Amino acid sequence: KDNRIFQFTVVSIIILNAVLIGATTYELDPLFLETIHLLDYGITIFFVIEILIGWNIFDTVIVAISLIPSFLVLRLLRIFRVLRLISVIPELKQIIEAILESVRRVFFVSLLLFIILYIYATMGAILFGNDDPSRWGDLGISLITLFQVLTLSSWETVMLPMQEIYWWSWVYFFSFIIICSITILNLVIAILVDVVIQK
Amino acid sequence: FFSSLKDNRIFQFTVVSIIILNAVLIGATTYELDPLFLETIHLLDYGITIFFVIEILIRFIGEKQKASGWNIFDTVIVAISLIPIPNNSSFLVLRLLRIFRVLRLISVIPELKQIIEAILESVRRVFFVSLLLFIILYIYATMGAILFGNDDPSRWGDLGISLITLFQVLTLSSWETVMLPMQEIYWWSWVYFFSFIIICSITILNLVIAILVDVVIQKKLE
Amino acid sequence: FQFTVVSIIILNAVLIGELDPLFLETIHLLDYGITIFFVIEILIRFIGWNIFDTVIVAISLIPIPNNSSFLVLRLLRIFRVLRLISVIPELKQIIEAILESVRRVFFVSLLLFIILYIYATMGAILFGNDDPSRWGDLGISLITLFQVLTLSSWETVMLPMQEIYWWSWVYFFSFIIICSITILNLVIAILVDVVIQKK
Amino acid sequence: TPFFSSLKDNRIFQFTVVSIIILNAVLIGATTYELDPLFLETIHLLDYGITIFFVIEILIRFIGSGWNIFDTVIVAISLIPVLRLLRIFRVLRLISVIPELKQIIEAILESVRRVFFVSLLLFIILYIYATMGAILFGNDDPSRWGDLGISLITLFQVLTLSSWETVMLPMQEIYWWSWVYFFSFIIICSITILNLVIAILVDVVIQKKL
C-alpha cells in the first residue's frame, strides 16, 4: 500500500479532482478530465479494499461516501472525497491524534482566555459603550472586538478612536494584549511539555 | 454524596457550559429568544453555585483545625456569585458582579488553578523583557518624534503617541501605513522601521526561549 | 572575516535606486571578479552542492545585455545574488535544516488544506450570495480563508457576514482556532525532530 | 566603604530607582505648565541624584569587561546637562541598575550570529521574489513593484503578514496565478523562520544541558 511516490501522485490526483469543480472548466482537454476522474475512482477503490481486511469506522464511512459518483449533497461528496486523503497518507493520522491530545489543554487555556475577554468586554462595553457602539455597544460585539484585538488584526482601529476620548486608552488595550499574549505563551509551552512527557 | 461529582468530566463540561451561556446571554440583545430555555439556564446556573456553597461548607466542616489562597478566592467568588444575583441590571455595581459569576469557572476545574500558578510564574521573565522593550520603544520613539515629528504629528506629535505608534508597529498591525508615508520623504525610513522590527522580534524571541528552557529545566531531559 | 564579500555581492545586487561617481563601477567590475575565484575554486577540487555552486557560479560567469534585451538580465541578477550561498557556508546549513523540515511541513500543509476546503465550501455555500467577491466560488473562498488563516485584517471578511448572519463567529472563530492548534502541533513536531539528533 | 558596592543590589531600592528614571523620562517634557512644579522639579533633581550616585558607585568599586565600559560610558553621558539625543542615553542606566537586563542583552547578543545568517537567506528569497514581481506587477501597480527598492519593502510588509491581501488581491484580478506567487512566498519564509526559532533554541540548550 505505502510507497512515497505513488502516495504523492495520489495526493496529486485526489486534490486536482477536488479543485477542478467546476466553473473553471468551461473548456479544457476533456480526455485529461476523464483520466483524472477515472483515476480518482481507482483510488476510492484502492482503500475501499485494503479496508476489507476507531479509525476504521472513519476509513469506511469516508471511502463509502467517496464511492457515490443535488446542491448540498454534491458539496458534501466533494468534502468526503477530499477526506480520503487521510486514509492515504498515514502520517496525517498520527498528526490528527496529536491535535486531539492538544484539545484538552487547549480547552482549558481557552476557558482562561474567555475569562480575560469577558472581563475586558464588560469593562469595555461599560467604558466604550456609547462612544463607539458598533464595537462596544452590546457585550457580544464587545467580545467579537476584543477578539479581533487579541489577534492584533488592525487593532489600532479599535483603540485610537477611544484614545482621543480617554487618555488611559492604551492601558486598557496594551494590558489586554499583553495579558493574552502571556497566557497563549503558557498554552504553547504546556502542550510541548505534555507532548514530551507523553513519550 | 457531594464529595464525588466535582471530579466528573461530563459534569464539569455541562456545568462550565451552563456558566458561560448564563454569563453571555444578556440582556436586550436577547429581547427575543425562547424565554423557557433562558429561564432554565439561569435557574440552573444559580443551582450550580448553590451546589458549590454546599461543597465548600463541607471542606470547611472538614479541616480538623478550621484554619488555599483558593479557599479565600473560592469562597469569595462563590459568596459573591451567590446571593447578589443581577440581570439586564442598570448601573452599575451588579454589572461588575457578572464578572465574579463567570470567575466561578476556576472553582469548577483544577487544571485552571494549576495553569494560573504557571502563568504567575512566567511573570518575572515577562516583566524584565518588558523593561527592555520599553527601553527600545523609547529610543525609537524619540529618534522618531524628532525625525518624523513635524511631518506626521498624527503619530509622532509627542513622545506618548510616538510610543503608541511603535507598539502598533511592534505587533505588526497595518504597520505599512505607519512607515510607507515616511518612505516618500526620508529614504532611510525603511532602515529605521525594519531595524526596530527585527530588534523587537529578536528580543521577544529570546523571551520565549527563556521561559521554554525554564519550564524544561523544571522537568524533563534529566 | 567573510563579511566584506557579502557586502560587495549584496551591494552590487541592490544598486540602481545616482551616487558613487564611478566607485559604483569599482563595485561593478569588482563584484564581477568575485565569481571568477569560484569558477576557479570549484576546479581546484577533485578525485551535490557542486551541482549548485557550478550552475550558479557559471551563470554568474555570463556577461550582460547592453542597450539591449533586458530579457534575461534579471534572471542573471538572481543567479549572481545566489552565489552568496556558495560562499557563505552557514547558509548551506540553514538550507539543509529547511529541507529537513520540508516533509513534516508538506503533511501538515495537506491538513491545513483539508480544513480550508471544508471551510471554503461551508463558507461558499453560506456567504456565496452576500459577498461573491470573497465567497463567489472555491478559488477566492480559499484565498479569503487563507487571508483569515494569516489573521491579516480578517475582521473585514467576517464583519459583513456578522450583520447578516448572527452565528458568523462560530464559523470564523473555529476556523481560526482549529488552524492555530494544528499549526501549533507542527512547530512542536519539528522542534522535537531536531533535538532528536542531540538526545 | 561598602555602602555602594552593596546598594545597587537591593530589590526595593532598584524598583524605586527605575520608577524614578522612568518617570523623569516619560514626563520630560510635553507637560510641565501646571503639574506640581515643585514635584517635577523634584523628579529631575532626584533623577540626577541617581546618576551622581552611580558615578560614586563606580569610582568606589573601581578603587577596590564590557559592562563596566557600557556602565562607565553611560553614567558618563548621563552626567551631562545631534544632542536632543542626550536624554536617550540616560534611559540606558536602567540596564546598569538591573542585573537582569544585563543577562538578557547578553543572551540576545548570542542570538545575533544565527539571526544574521538566516537574514541573509531571507534576503535571498525576498530578492528572488521582489525581482520576479518587479517584472510581473511593475506596469500594473508600480507604487509597490516599480523598482527593487519598493518591491523589497513591499515584500517585507507581505512577509510580516500585515495587511497583505491589499498587495495580493489587486494582482489577483489581473493575473490568476498570483495566489501562487504570494502564497508560496509566505510558506517559504515561514519554513525558514521556524528553522531560525528552533535553531536558536537548540543553540541555547546546547549551551549547557546534555
Ligand SMILES: CCCCCCCCCO[C@@H]1O[C@H](CO)[C@@H](O)[C@H](O)[C@H]1O
Ligand atoms: C475564545 C473566546 C471567544 C469569545 C467570542 C464570543 C463572541 C460572542 C458574540 O455573541 C454575539 O454577539 C452579537 C452582537 O450583538 C449578537 O448579534 C449575536 O447574537 C451573538 O451571538
Ligand SMILES: CCCCCCCCCO[C@@H]1O[C@H](CO)[C@@H](O)[C@H](O)[C@H]1O
Ligand atoms: C512595551 C511597553 C511600552 C508601553 C508604552 C506606553 C506608552 C504610553 C503613552 O503615553 C500616553 O501618551 C498619550 C499621547 O497623547 C497621552 O495622551 C497619554 O496621557 C499618555 O499616557
Ligand SMILES: CCCCCCCCCO[C@@H]1O[C@H](CO)[C@@H](O)[C@H](O)[C@H]1O
Ligand atoms: C494552505 C493551503 C491553501 C492553498 C490555497 C489554494 C488556492 C486556491 C485558489 O484557486 C484560485 O482561485 C482563483 C479565484 O478565481 C482563480 O482565479 C485561480 O485560477 C485559482 O487557482
Ligand SMILES: CCCCCCCCCO[C@@H]1O[C@H](CO)[C@@H](O)[C@H](O)[C@H]1O
Ligand atoms: C530582509 C532584508 C530585506 C530588506 C530589503 C531592503 C529594501 C531596500 C529598499 O531601498 C529603498 O528603495 C527605495 C525605492 O527607490 C528608495 O527610495 C530608498 O532610497 C531605498 O532605501
Ligand SMILES: [Ca+2]
Ligand atoms: Ca498580524
Ligand SMILES: [Ca+2]
Ligand atoms: Ca548538564
